Task: structure prediction
Amino acid sequence: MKTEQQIADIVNRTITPLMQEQAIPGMAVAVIYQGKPYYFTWGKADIANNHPVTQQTLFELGSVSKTFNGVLGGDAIARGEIKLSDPVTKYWPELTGKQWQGIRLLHLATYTEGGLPLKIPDDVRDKAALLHFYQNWQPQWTPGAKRLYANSSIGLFGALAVKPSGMSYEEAMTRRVLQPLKLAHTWITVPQNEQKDYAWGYREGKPVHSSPGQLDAEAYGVKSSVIDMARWVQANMDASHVQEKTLQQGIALAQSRYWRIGDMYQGLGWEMLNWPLKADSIINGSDSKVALAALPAVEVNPPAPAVKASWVHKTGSTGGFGSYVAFVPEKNLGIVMLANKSYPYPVRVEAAWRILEKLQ
Result:
């Protein structure tokens, strides 16, 4: 097995040119290797004010937030509070249009509802406007026909999934996921006494933070540190240490296979491919030209239970940040890459692959 110095050499050999070539001000990486997390930090969380990246720096996860959504939903399934087969109208009866009649929670959770838009429109800023938007949306195809990635589908799934609990989404996420997993540096809303650790994102050489929007927490609005993200990857890779039974089962359910889209399988938030695999499949699959395309979907019903021989991963971005998380349960190997600049998805995936390939 490799020493810490050997792992550091491997990580730095990839990250050093990456940050220079992509003009990334700050990064934090965790490698999970033979059961242990190894942490690395470089650069600046705030350039003008000279604040370094540390193991406590908070990064905007962007759509990596959907992995938290999927686990919270899995926990609700395990609690018996919801079933993915339930109609959306069980939880939002005011969606009375015929286009909602056959849409199930399953479809919202997995981008298979019929073609909701990538984001809720900017001018939808209250509950009345949100209802109007969904009521008047018209699908492009029947439920299950295609997978088309969106924030507005899984975002609504998260809002509906927590209804039986009587809690807000943020309250339920905190009580049911973050607190049991001891994720004390993971936030939907960063409190004032933690703002000192909230990195600035950089877009076109200017510091930026993400703007709020409807159903943001549910789809793209989580912030977290490298320590918490490593602990999150560890718990998702192997939840045998998680003593809360419904949370352990909910983690497993987010890695069930619900749909087959070529060689990719859709979990709850997490996306999976069989392992072993060819690097080009994930690198090319991460390009927006594939990842954002509407592709035919094949249902896996009942969902296939998690298998160890899988590459489990999720990309995410905001205006100023780019993140990537991936793990292989069979190998007990994983990686977290957090950066305060958005940079191309295939570059993220290739760098992660290069590191993990040397740690086989």
